[PDB]
Symmetry: D2
Subunit: 363 residues, 4 copies
């Protein structure tokens, strides 16, 4: 085929600049774009209600930390509502993140819907009018975006149709984003559920990353103006055989090494149902693995960067300072891990009180 | 490759029923689903401004036609606004049609959107919420829907990307429609512009369809409960090469046979700017073709049915008899054509009616 | 693709004329292409000497079937060896086939080879220097040729790579043939092995059939000059449920209706371990299935038309006239079968055969 | 999809070992696999008869030089013929090559065959018997194989079919090599013929390479035990534009970086028709590209090493030492180039080269 410049060289420069500012060495992303119902679950768990004012409050907390976290966070992923929310001193949240030293992010997908004739599979929707939302959002104060899809490993899942769909739908969204100066973060989230061991996870991950990078090539997306946010190679949470961080490190680096091109600027690992300490330890391990790593390997933790701070606040407005402090600490730990310079804090077991959910309820 | 029934015998049986009723021998489709804008223009050229009760009376005129049209009409495709309009007595339009023996349909796409670095090509949107909307429409009166995808022929069009995407989006629309118990029509309209010859048009038509039914397969579409709305096979509007209606017939059926599996219940053609008489002549020829045709070949005419009828409107109820019979005659002509029973009927009348150039400043 | 003629109108016709003459009403193909090894399996199994002469005799035995067989046989496929073999009357085998009114065909494939990473599934080799061979074969008296690609239904098979590989390989073989003026017989044979039921067999047959034709489109294959040689949709040879001949028929017709374009001239069927009369019953049932099938449903049986003949023969040249009559008998039956006019006296038939699964000793 | 191993750790390791040995710092590949007809091109030129005698003596001349270039050549590819020839010492050529400290490789493909419906595009053959052959070659001393794929850019080429077909045939070739302990060097050769610009070539390159590795994924290939032999991104032979060596590099490295997985152990650039001098200059430049280059960039040159050495021969025995020192000369400078340590840019205007398409005679 032959030439048809989708983006101008000027636009290309913009995307590269931004995509590169986010994944700077030592920085990572804080994912605080949880939807209304989702976050409602968090407030219920402690003893707090889920009101507008409260939401505005909790957010303001993580967002008002001291400048220790400044060289640690390259970006934050906000929820639509939060975008137009003001601080106590009247400062708009988007601007307040700017003052710290990071870029504004915004979730844009409109939830997953089911696929007919598949063993409980889904694809994500939300393309209708996307470009308009992006032009407006760029104007309002956001620079990049996050779009998620959900795949699961099982007997004979994911399906050819599922990997096919999501990978093309992700490329589709990506194209739109760039035409509006928005760096797209592609998130091919695989479920850590099941009795599949580590081997099966690595196998599934590769074939996915292959499917996603081909779809993007066909779609003419500017790789340098993108980011990848995948799951680490890990067995099902119900799996029997335990593995070491070294094995978890090797497996993850290997799959990416065989599927992610060096044009890609960064791989931002999500939390993935892991506790705070595990997340950090795995991040450090991945950045220690003796293999050639051309792209920055950082994090994009949601609750993995919160947990403590959450129950620290506990609704009790007076518990503010202590909470914020806990979170700041978790930020430093990660800043160190993404650069292979972190060391464990404690080998006891203060991690997750709802870990494997199959035996006797959850929400 | 493990199957999963997206539909049960009961689900299937229903979709297969609605499809056979609309394409029943003699019956064709009335596509009067023009958007508020597109119809505003149609009205303005006869002293009628873009006002609701105008376009509500216009929709009523056609709908309130003498029972002679009952058989000619298998199905009527409506728009959101019209679907919720009542006739001058109290009964809503869905019921006016149902009492006449036709089946109700609804247009559900949300227009087109520019593509990822292509040659001015596009893809169609409208998947968000489609699911609930399909159920609300079912509850309200729609038993079938319409989605339109537009292709273009050129030195490098349609592109490989173009074909793939437009085919994937139609299949996703199709599935969701079938779950909600609504028959989905697939309309992959190629453009009749440019100086492309008949062979060019035919050949392009062949690639796109092959990929379409192949896309339908991958999503597990119940072929028997669907309708294909293709652009008839003809050269470009700028072509200087004359062709008989016979040649045009051949290119059409030949193209169909090679890509349309016999499971498909019916194929309804579009006009494409061609005069209503010619649309009827061509349609009649396609049906007189010696080649075996396993699927019904009828019509879905909008302009080719409203042209003259509207052209004979002056203001109120005066032409509310003159106009009706006009469209009635056209229904009676096309009903014969879908049966190879349309006597040539030499067009020995006044000029064709759409946008006729008597433009200076009259009287 | 703008439009690039890969075949001329002159070229096309020749293909379609040969393609049609083979599948005329009553006609069917005799697949006596039992290779040097595969024949030994059925020759030196019963002690009969495996030798070129004995092989030479056997063929001429079937090839001398009087004029009664003529109308029943459209074409005969031979092994490379038999092509260059003459008869006792000094005449070379091809000339005799032709004087009978049948077309001469030959197997061009070079056997299957396993794929690394699959669960026992294979692909086929044999394209090297095929054009050269096709020229020599046309030159030598051959008008058509066949190539087989075998697939298997299992726990997780067939795999996407299986479907993809065998399908794209068939399309290549076909385009080589068409250029040399050779009618190709695509043969996606799915083996009846495994404890899978009827519906399952239909499902995996549907996807395999959708893939094959999409590939041909991409390769610019002329469907009007080809023949499809598939297997019948039946349960595995280890199923617990018995089904009626009407079921296998309805399952077979519906599947083809959902995948094969009306442009395809004919479909030749495989025996697949069926009894001679069982294959006969089935072929007759498919021809009377109330669904509208647009193609010629005929046979391409080998063992099913040759079983009794070998046995009747006994290696004694003195049983000649008996052995032939066994073949002739079967040809007639299936001649009546390929057109739904074959009913055993009484007009009621046998359903099951083995039943070593549909009883008590299966649980 | 489902997990299915193809190679054991035993095989993987051995594969990586040979691969890394070849693409070692300072080492590159000598391509002396010139078929009888190809050899007859220049042997006739240097007044020497085309006989196995001098053909043997020529290849010998290349091997029997001084060990000053041993660190230079890591691999040598020959023709089937030379594999079983011997030197004046009495020992076989592969012995000579092994003792000299180099890996023996052989060409397995059987030329290019034309594809119908295309604008003069081909695809390679050879797969038949491949496995049996490679087994024979390895036992004989061969360790790596070569397969040439051809791709010409044009106003209508490469076509999807050309890119699809050719990529899968390479995946097939590799898989078989792996199962036989042979390291497959895949090479999608882009042709410099045409008037096209530098950007156009890069655009196509990126598309091709994306399709190549995608196919490698589905076929379950071990990329660590594979090598890539691509062309450098340059303008067409009839391009009226002038480009600087560094600019040529940039474009080439970007194409690779945008599509090639870190897993790929080495990238052996093909001569492509440049003068020995610039072949080294461009390769040299490519290594000075400040962008991250995670895979060895080296050479796979034939004429680019033998060119001057041929002139210094012309079928004479008195010039043994003569011709040799020219080869040693060529090899060394390229070892330095593969290290980015070859004399910088400057020598571009003392002699210039064939570029009549850039003078006033191109109008």
């Amino acid at each position: 085929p032959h030439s048809h410049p989708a983006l101008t060289p000027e636009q290309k420069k913009e995307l590269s600049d931004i995509a590169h500012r986010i994944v700077a060495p030592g920085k990572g992303i804080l994912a605080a774009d949880e939807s209304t119902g989702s976050i409602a679950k968090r407030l219920q768990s402690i003893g707090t209600e889920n009101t507008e004012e409260n939401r505005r409050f909790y957010r303001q907390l993580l967002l008002t930390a001291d400048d220790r976290v400044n060289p640690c966070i390259g970006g934050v992923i906000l929820f639509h509502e939060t975008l137009y929310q003001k601080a106590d001193d009247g400062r708009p949240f988007p601007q307040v993140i700017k003052s710290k030293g990071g870029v504004v992010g915004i979730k844009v997908d409109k939830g997953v819907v089911p696929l007919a004739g598949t063993n409980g599979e889904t694809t994500t929707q939300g393309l209708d009018g996307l470009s308009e939302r992006c032009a407006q959002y760029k104007k309002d104060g956001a620079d990049f975006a996050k779009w998620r899809c959900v795949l699961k490993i099982g007997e004979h899942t994911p399906s050819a149709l599922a990997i096919m769909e999501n990978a093309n739908v992700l490329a589709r969204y990506a194209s739109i984003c760039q035409q509006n100066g928005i760096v797209p973060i592609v998130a091919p989230e695989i479920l850590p559920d099941g009795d599949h061991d580590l081997k099966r996870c690595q196998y599934v991950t590769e074939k996915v990353l292959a499917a996603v990078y081909k779809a993007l090539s066909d779609h003419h997306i500017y790789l340098e103006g993108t980011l990848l946010k995948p799951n680490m190679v890990t067995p099902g949470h119900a799996c029997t055989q335990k593995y070491s961080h070294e094995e978890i490190a090797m497996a993850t680096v290997t799959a990416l090494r065989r599927t992610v091109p060096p044009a890609v600027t960064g791989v931002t690992f999500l939390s993935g149902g892991q506790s705070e300490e595990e997340a950090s330890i795995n991040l450090n391990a991945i950045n220690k693995c003796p293999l050639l790593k051309p792209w920055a390997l950082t994090f994009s933790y949601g609750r993995a960067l919160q947990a403590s701070a959450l129950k620290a606040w506990g609704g009790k407005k007076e518990n503010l300072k202590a909470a914020q402090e806990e979170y700041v600490k978790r930020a430093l730990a990660n800043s160190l891990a993404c650069q292979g310079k972190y060391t464990p804090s404690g080998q006891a077991g203060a991690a997750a009180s709802e870990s494997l959910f199959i035996s006797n309820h959850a929400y």
